[PDB]
Amino acid sequence: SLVLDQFGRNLTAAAMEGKLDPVIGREKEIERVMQVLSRRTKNNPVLIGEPGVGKTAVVEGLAQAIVHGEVPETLKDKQLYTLDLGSLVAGSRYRGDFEERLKKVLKEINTRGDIILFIDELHTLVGAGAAEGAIDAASILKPKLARGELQTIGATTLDEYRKYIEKDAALERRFQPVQVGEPTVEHTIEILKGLRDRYEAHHRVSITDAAMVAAATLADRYINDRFLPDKAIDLIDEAGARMRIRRMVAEVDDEQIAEVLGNWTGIPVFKLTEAETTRLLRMEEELHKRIIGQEDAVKAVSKAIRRTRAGLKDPKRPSGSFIFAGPSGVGKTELSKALANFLFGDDDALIQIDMGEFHDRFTASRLFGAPPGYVGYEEGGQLTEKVRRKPFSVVLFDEIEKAHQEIYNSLLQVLEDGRLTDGQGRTVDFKNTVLIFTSNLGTERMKQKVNDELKKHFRPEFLNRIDDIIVFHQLTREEIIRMVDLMISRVAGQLKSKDMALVLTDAAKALLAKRGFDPVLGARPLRRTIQREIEDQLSEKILFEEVGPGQVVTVDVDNWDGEGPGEDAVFTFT
Amino acid sequence: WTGIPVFKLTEAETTRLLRMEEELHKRIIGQEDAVKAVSKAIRRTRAGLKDPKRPSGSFIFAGPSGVGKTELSKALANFLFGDDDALIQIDMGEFHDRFTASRLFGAPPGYVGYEEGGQLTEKVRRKPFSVVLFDEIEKAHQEIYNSLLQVLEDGRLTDGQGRTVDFKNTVLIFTSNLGTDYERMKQKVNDELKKHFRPEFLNRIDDIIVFHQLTREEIIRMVDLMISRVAGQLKSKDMALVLTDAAKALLAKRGFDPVLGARPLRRTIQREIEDQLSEKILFEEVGPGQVVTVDVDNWDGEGPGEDAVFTFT
Amino acid sequence: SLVLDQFGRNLTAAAMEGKLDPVIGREKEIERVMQVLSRRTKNNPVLIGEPGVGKTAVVEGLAQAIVHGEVPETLKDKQLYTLDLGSLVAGSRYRGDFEERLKKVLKEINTRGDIILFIDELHTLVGAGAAEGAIDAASILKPKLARGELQTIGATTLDEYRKYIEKDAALERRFQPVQVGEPTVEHTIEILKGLRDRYE
Ligand SMILES: Nc1ncnc2c1ncn2[C@@H]1O[C@H](COP(=O)(O)OP(=O)(O)O)[C@@H](O)[C@H]1O
Ligand SMILES: Nc1ncnc2c1ncn2[C@@H]1O[C@H](COP(=O)(O)OP(=O)(O)O)[C@@H](O)[C@H]1O
Ligand SMILES: Nc1ncnc2c1ncn2[C@@H]1O[C@H](COP(=O)(O)OP(=O)(O)O)[C@@H](O)[C@H]1O
Ligand SMILES: Nc1ncnc2c1ncn2[C@@H]1O[C@H](COP(=O)(O)OP(=O)(O)O)[C@@H](O)[C@H]1O
């Protein structure tokens, strides 16, 4: 007892005082472990599982089963000791110290005979006192473990089992695997219901059953870098901590779990208040604050985001996938910029990928990285990593028709299931991101021309996965008048920072409108008209210090009937 | 230990294995040939009467888009393991480049990522009994099939690290989209597969299955199948939806097109029911504790219904 | 304290003399850190932030909050020590010296219980001294982090996180990411107004 205690911790006395958490739902794996230790030769199981499933929890539950007495006679009255390799290695300046300590431990185990050894993180045994080919813990344990005279229990994750143990086939032979599979949703709910009491006592808060059901569902659905039941426990524990901080008896509901998840991952799953609800209902006007015209596209996107925010989106598919195909300059990109501004408050959050560069057969690997064995393997994908930074995003694929079919064959993955496997092998989540595909093709009859061009330039499946195909309409006179108003407002807002005030009469706005209309319009022209007839004149006029700072500038027009072409009209800057 | 299901067939398991054709028909409407072939393969595998060298099953699936080729594999995984996420899904859409194939089995020694190993081989070693799905196999280059060439016949793959993995107990499924009256389509699909793939690869596969186009009965049952998802989603918010049969008829009328598969129907449902119900929910017109009876007015049930709308109660 | 002063620096004692710059406008991140540090199991936050944003600034603000006493009861009068891994593995020359120093540090922390660790460049835990016969500090720390018996705070670049901690999922599990994003323009102006007195 005195020898093992300085080099290990006894889980039996830990479960005597209840210091270990109760373990429930693990009868199959614990029975598997108990039946492996009841063998004659090679009675050593190692718990292989994905990290965060309960590999140490299985051993704690077995210790509780031992101390209660549900074990058979082969595991009855057995003190389960974990072994700390760090305590063995530390303090050993010399060969004799470490090997003497390990063999004294083994002699005490074989003398008392009722200590089952536990090696958490079993991959540490390949090299303890020296390298893999010298005298260490593994080469001392191997003759003992081969005959089964030393009962030990291991725990190693999947990847480290592949890496460290499997390169040492001698230890791989002597350990019989016990797979601890990831628990289900109902299993996680049961586990949380079991662990209610400890967290309730610790955080001085009370937790409801609906809170735990919501925690399990949200943790399984959204968080895709951790594994059940750890993420559900994380959400519950963090909500309890939030209540403990905020009160300094509180209640935890699913709303607080949603808040914790929103803090953790940024996914906008919240209980909607009145102000954001009226914002969501009236957001078509909010988008129409910036974009002018094109009611169909804003309507479709409003429908998609309203469906997403109300919990009515198919969870295996993204929030929405759109093809914005229409004549150049209409505002296909500006709709995406307006979406970014609405959803995040800033426009730099729009992950914009340009398909102009992806015209070669070698550049498809930029999105999802390079395969193993090639240059760029560690960096991985550019798009996948950008998505992993923030799971809720608007992904913009600008100028689709430039890129050729290999990228779309890559993107059928995300268009169907919202998954993408980068070069490093990891799968990333796209179940919440909004996909926008902007195209410049086909330039009521324009609708059919664009549809025919897209059917000719695409395979049927890629057009089929897309939620809504939206064809942008050409602009009219009222829309370009409002565009002129918006551009002048932008100029005035930029000029506010230089101690200025700017204003235009409606005659100047009309004159700008009459010189900015043709079927090849958009905002690429009629903004060049602004830069040529307003901005340039203002710059040259303020460079030689007339109507400088503190002076309101009024842009007027003379020699114009207000209806004519206005080619002889000139802008006057008072 | 290994998870490979060799046991004594209990009566419940036996009567399930006799009746698993309609169990597959629970999630797939129509496509009797593919369900037939999958049932034959699973019956051969679980009876203990199987070729030791060849894999459990090797199928190539062909048909139009959205005829349930991936849905069949997902429902087969749901049958065997209980959930879709146990399906080992490798989509060949990322493997267009010839240099990309090293991700499948792994990096050779002396190169970066050698210690990481492959992706397909390691996931097969994790679960030796698995349904391996290869989506859109034509979109990968032809040199990628060369790695699968020997697992399709001998069921063994040699990774970069040198280990030999066992593909003997897995069900290999290929899904294609080539070819896009039934016999003419089958002949065209077979000819396209023959001229697209080398004949030494087509001979090593078990059955070539062509998916039949969806008919009116199939899509009108599939209306129910895909609205059950919305009903279950609504059940999480303490409110229920029941469709009038007129709503089902109108949804099946506006979502049917022989040119494509099932996703036009999902578009029709999503635009007619999901979006409008989202507006009604966020307006708080309807909430928890109520029922929603969706009905079609201004319609006769036979006409095309270019003016019919949906009423929500 | 006799062993930690040889290997670490006391930020609470540093905040006693006000040698740390005032931290302005980072109340949300400090609240998130105190939220994570208040948990029962896995109470280790990592400040996942781009370089140049103030990852260490968040920790010094937390130390100033602790010394000013506005923290909740679960962080009241707890000395926040930064852990200098270079000094821990500085004089070893052997196989058992570094692990002995780590055991002494952890035993002093356990017998005190009011000391929170801070690890600049948290990715240095993996491979924190790995000779032919040595066990790195990550494998020592992992059982204590999983049970929640040790409160550690980490600061790590996004890219460094992805290169190093992402490769080790066992240690990645024990740390909750805390997104520290770039301050906006107005936030930068507020920070400059805070730092006016010191720079003047
Ligand atoms: N059946 C269960 N009952 C109670 N708690 C559980 C159960 N399964 C898992 N847990 C919790 O999840 C955690 C699992 O940790 P574990 O997976 O052993 O870590 P590692 O993967 O590093 O070995 C434990 O802290 C435990 O509290
Ligand atoms: N209706 C509009 N409202 C506001 N800005 C617009 C509008 N239409 C165009 N713009 C501006 O003009 C640009 C046109 O972009 P876009 O239509 O995407 O060009 P293209 O169609 O050639 O890709 C946008 O970046 C936007 O700033
Ligand atoms: N017969 C069917 N029964 C139910 N759903 C179907 C059926 N056919 C297609 N689907 C729908 O189509 C999608 C799968 O289509 P898929 O088989 O992947 O087509 P492809 O393989 O050509 O891409 C699923 O989301 C499913 O909802
Ligand atoms: N909110 C803030 N208030 C005051 N100073 C800040 C704030 N945020 C950042 N700083 C300044 O930024 C610097 C911190 O950078 P640091 O986090 O050390 O970068 P890195 O961790 O990459 O070395 C400090 O000098 C600090 O003064």
Numbering used by the authors:
A (entry chain C): 168 to 415, 476 to 670, 691 to 821
B (entry chain D): 491 to 670, 689 to 821
C (entry chain B): 168 to 367
What text appears in the publication on this structure?
The unfoldase ClpC1 is one of the most exciting drug targets against tuberculosis. This AAA+ unfoldase works in cooperation with the ClpP1P2 protease and is the target of at least four natural product antibiotics: cyclomarin, ecumicin, lassomycin, and rufomycin. While ClpP alone is able to rapidly hydrolyze peptides, the degradation of large proteins requires the presence of a hexameric AAA+ ATPase complex, such as ClpX or ClpC1.
To further stabilize the sample, considering that ATP is being continuously degraded even at low temperatures and that some AAA+ proteins have been shown to hydrolyze ATP analogs, we introduced two additional mutations in the double walker B motif (E288A and E626A). We hypothesized that these mutations allow nucleotide binding but prevent hydrolysis and therefore further stabilize the hexameric assembly. After initial cryo-EM grid screening, a dataset was collected of the apo form of MtbClpC1E288A/F444A/E626A (see Experimental procedures). Processing of the data resulted in a structure for apo ClpC1 determined to a resolution of 3.6 Å (see Experimental procedures). As expected, the overall structure of apo MtbClpC1E288A/F444A/E626A consists of a hexamer composed of six ClpC1 subunits (A–F), with the D1 and D2 domains arranged in a ring that together forms a pore through which the substrate can be actively translocated. In line with recent structures, including the recent cryo-EM structure of B. subtilis ClpC, the observed ClpC1 hexamer is not symmetric, as observed originally in the crystal structure of ClpC, and instead adopts an asymmetric spiral structure. The presence of substrates in the pore formed by D1 and D2 has been previously reported for other members of the family, but as no substrate has been added to our cryo-EM sample preparation, it was probably taken up and trapped inside of the inactive protein during purification. Furthermore, all nucleotide-binding sites in D1 are occupied by ADP, while for D2, four sites are occupied by ADP (subunits B, C, D, and E), while two are in their apo state (subunits A and F). Finally, the NTD and its adjacent 26 residue linker are not visible in our apo ClpC1 structure.
